[PDB]
Amino acid sequence: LHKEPATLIKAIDGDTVKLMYKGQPMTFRLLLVDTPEFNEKYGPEASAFTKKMVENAKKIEVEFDKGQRTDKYGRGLAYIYADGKMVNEALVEQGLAKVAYVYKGNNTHEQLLRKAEAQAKKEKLNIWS
Ligand SMILES: Cc1cn([C@H]2C[C@H](OP(=O)(O)O)[C@@H](COP(=O)(O)O)O2)c(=O)[nH]c1=O
Ligand SMILES: [Ca+2]
Numbered sequence: 001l002h003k004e005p006a007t008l009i010k011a012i013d014g015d016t017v018k019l020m021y022k023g024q025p026m027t028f029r030l031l032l033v034d035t036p037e038f039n040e041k042y043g044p045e046a047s048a049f050t051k052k053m054v055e056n057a058k059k060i061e062v063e064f065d066k067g068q069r070t071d072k073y074g075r076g077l078a079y080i081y082a083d084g085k086m087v088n089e090a091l092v093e094q095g096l097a098k099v100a101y102v103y104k105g106n107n108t109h110e111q112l113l114r115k116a117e118a119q120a121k122k123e124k125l126n127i128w129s
């Protein structure tokens with residue numbers, strides 16, 4: 001896998017963000033995770049976490065996996081990095097997302113994210129509290 005540039009257009013919620021990629025606006029859905037909806041418990045906190053992380057970054061990058069690059073709703077499916085830290089991983093380390101939606105062929109960072117979830121669950125953080 002490889003990182004490609006993008007710039008933020010707008011934070012949406014815990015696991016969706018609007019980015020400019022190859023010069024075109026796209027909504028990205030973070031691979032391999034699930035944040036609560038804004039209306040559910042920990043939703044606001046996930047949205048805020050992601051928002052802060054993407055808005056404060058000097059450098060946003062997109063990393064597609066090996067499979068499908070857009071989902072059935074036209075959202076890009078990627079690992080998104082903010083100054084080299086994976087937002088997908090950071091949410092999970094924080095107990096603000098679960099590992100979820102693990103489809104064969106776009107699952108490169110599964111075990112990385114599961115390891116983070118195990119540690120969050122042991123700290124009993126947020127979702128795991
Ligand atoms: C994360 C991800 C979600 N999706 C689809 C599955 C779910 O379909 P359904 O809408 O039919 O439940 C939906 C979940 O995304 P959200 O959690 O953003 O709703 O997006 C993919 O198809 N591929 C993916 O990698
Ligand atoms: Ca969600």
